[PDB]
């Protein structure tokens, strides 16, 4: 039993730019094995990242346990990946 809005990929907004890849791998790997993690390296996409997990239940448990996580001095938000919302800039 899982809603269809959840997926294997999860987006993160308003992330600190000084965060390293090891801290992001430790924060994403707490709920399960993380398959891939892509951080933005653009001024128009700064503060956002995409973490794709190997399991759907592990990705749902990671998305349920990352909305409003304690980080550096910004308000980061974790949301589900959408095809129509990610390509809104094009």
């Amino acid at each position: 039993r899982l809603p269809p809005e959840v997926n294997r990929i999860l987006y993160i907004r308003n992330l600190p730019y000084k965060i390293t890849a090891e801290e992001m791998y430790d924060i994403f790997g707490k709920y399960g094995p993380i398959r891939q993690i892509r951080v933005g390296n653009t001024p128009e996409t700064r503060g956002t990242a995409y973490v794709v997990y190997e399991d759907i239940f592990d990705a749902k448990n990671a998305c349920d346990h990352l909305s409003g996580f304690n980080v550096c001095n910004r308000y980061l938000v974790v949301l589900y990946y959408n095809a129509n919302r990610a390509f809104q800039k094009m």
Partner: protein, 100 residues
């Protein structure tokens, strides 16, 4: 309730059993579903409150927390003099979301 048109009430003889409401539907009315200006409490029937059904929610059906009461717009419109406002059958409401 007023949101789901497929919901039906009991409309039985209301006894001395007072209706109860859960924490998610606390303060809301039974018919008008309003949380402003309560006027009179709801009276449950004898079949809707017996054994394990005592102290349960009338709208949702879970464990009760607070006391159920009707709004001020239902007491003046003679809506509290009808039967028991207990939801018996749940159709197309909180059933497909649990399986999905």
């Amino acid at each position: 309730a007023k949101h789901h048109p497929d919901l039906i009430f009991c409309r039985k003889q209301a006894g001395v059993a007072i209706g109860r409401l859960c924490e998610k539907c606390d303060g809301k009315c039974v018919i008008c579903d309003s949380y402003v200006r309560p006027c009179t409490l709801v009276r449950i029937c004898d079949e809707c409150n017996y054994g394990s059904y005592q102290g349960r929610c009338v709208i949702c059906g879970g464990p009760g927390v607070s006391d159920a009461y009707y709004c001020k717009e239902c007491t003046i419109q003679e809506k509290d003099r009808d039967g028991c406002p207990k939801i018996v059958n749940l159709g197309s409401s909180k059933t497909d979301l649990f399986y999905e």
